[PDB]
Structures are given as structure tokens and as C-alpha cells.
Design a protein around this nucleic acid. Structure first.
Length: 227
DNA sequence: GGTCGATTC
């Protein structure tokens, strides 16, 4: 995906993740407050280094000096583990981006309708990410990407790809530095949350413009002509 | 060496 919401407190996401390792993240009850998180901004990103959990603001986008196109923001789970470009990130740069849900735009002719997608059980999500370590250096070009997967079941009607969303136990496993690239692939295949676990609904077209940042951007909208 | 966000006063 290329847009999501990360609006609640750090402890809301961290309590669900339920890490048992030392946390190097100070207590902060203030909501992050972002309802329209866009590529090319710094995003709070979870990772594990020195056996400790860290939360760093990392650029969403990845463009090495040799890359002469716009920065990539997604990496396909089908190929990233063996990609010449993505393999080092898959091996050493795994991370987690937590969120309330994400946005997708459904082409309905020459008109695109945004939907907000989120867990049917009301819980937030952990999106699998890969990126350039060390994350704490604040690199302006080599940040992170959200791993994507084929849309399954109901989601393919909205759009053909989806973020790789991991259940909390798999998000913990994903971040561990001790596991191999092949093990990470097994975690991606074992912890991916199926589409029937999500709910989705149209939202205001205003979310399309990244200048718009209100909490109403995830609120649903009834779209019948006759009302 | 790749991928799917909109917007463009």
C-alpha cells in the first residue's frame, strides 16, 4: 500500500505486540495522530537491535545512489528474499510498521474510490517492513519499504495487492536478528493475516490529497445515489 | 538490482 493511518498511542500498538525483550522506548501516552501517512515522510518504525526493541522515525522510501528512479516504497513478498536489490534488507533490515489500517483506491471507471481497511476484530495491525540499517541514522534516501502480497478473498475486489500484515507473534519473530532469510520467508508465510479477518468501507475522497490530515479521513461514507 | 498511494496553483 501507499497510504495508511498510524493515529493512536505507542503503548496501544506495543501492548498488542507483547514483546518480552527489553524496550528502549520511553513511555509516551500522546496519540501519534497521523490519519494520512504518506510516502517520503519519516514514519515511526519498530525494530530490534542488541536484543532490544527500538522505535525510530525512518524515511518511507528506498533509493540507493545507483537507483535512478523514484524511491521504491513496497517490496513484493513473492520475490524480495532473492532480489539482488532487496536481499540484504530481507536478511538484515527487517522491521515492523504498526498501523490502524491502510487505504486502497478502487478504480470505478475513470473515478477512484478510497477504502479504509482494518481488522474486523478492532485490533491494530503490524505491517512487515524491510529497510536500511542502521535505522537510527535518519537516512534521507535509504529508509524502509512495506512488504506486499497478493490480495486474497474479498480484498482483490478493491485492489490487487495488500500489505503483508503479521499476527503479533509473527511480528515478534520477524524482527529477530538471529533468524535467517529463509526463516523470515517462513514467518511471512505462517503469520500473514488472511483477508477475511479484515473489514473495509469507502471513505471521503479527501484522503487522496496528502495535505488533508483530519481524523474524519478514516470515517466511513454511505455512497448510494438516492438518499 | 522495481513497484503501485494521490496529486499536480
Amino acid at each position: 500500500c501507499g497510504r495508511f493511518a498510524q493515529s493512536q498511542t505507542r503503548e496501544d500498538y506495543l501492548a498488542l505486540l507483547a514483546e518480552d525483550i527489553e524496550r528502549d522506548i520511553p513511555y509516551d501516552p500522546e496519540p501519534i495522530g497521523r490519519y494520512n501517512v504518506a510516502p517520503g515522510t519519516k514514519v515511526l518504525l519498530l525494530s530490534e537491535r542488541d536484543e532490544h526493541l527500538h522505535l525510530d522515525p525512518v524515511f518511507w522510501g528506498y533509493a540507493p545512489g545507483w537507483w535512478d528512479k523514484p524511491p521504491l516504497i513496497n517490496a513484493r513478498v513473492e520475490t524480495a528474499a532473492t532480489s539482488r536489490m532487496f536481499k540484504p534488507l530481507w536478511q538484515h533490515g527487517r522491521a515492523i510498521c504498526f498501523a490502524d489500517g491502510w487505504f486502497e483506491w478502487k478504480k470505478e471507471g475513470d473515478k477512484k474510490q478510497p477504502f479504509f481497511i482494518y481488522r474486523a476484530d478492532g485490533q491494530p495491525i503490524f505491517m512487515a517492513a524491510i529497510g536500511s540499517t542502521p535505522f537510527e541514522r535518519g537516512d534521507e534516501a535509504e529508509g524502509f519499504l512495506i512488504v506486499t502480497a497478493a490480495a486474497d478473498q474479498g480484498l482483490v475486489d478493491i485492489h490487487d495487492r495488500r500489505p503483508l500484515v503479521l499476527s503479533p507473534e509473527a511480528a515478534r519473530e520477524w524482527m529477530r536478528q538471529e533468524i535467517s532469510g529463509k526463516e523470515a520467508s517462513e514467518i511471512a508465510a505462517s503469520g500473514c493475516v488472511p483477508a477475511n479477518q479484515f473489514s473495509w468501507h469507502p471513505v471521503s475522497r479527501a484522503v487522496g490529497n496528502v495535505k488533508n490530515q483530519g481524523a474524519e479521513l478514516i470515517q466511513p461514507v454511505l455512497e448510494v445515489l438516492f438518499q
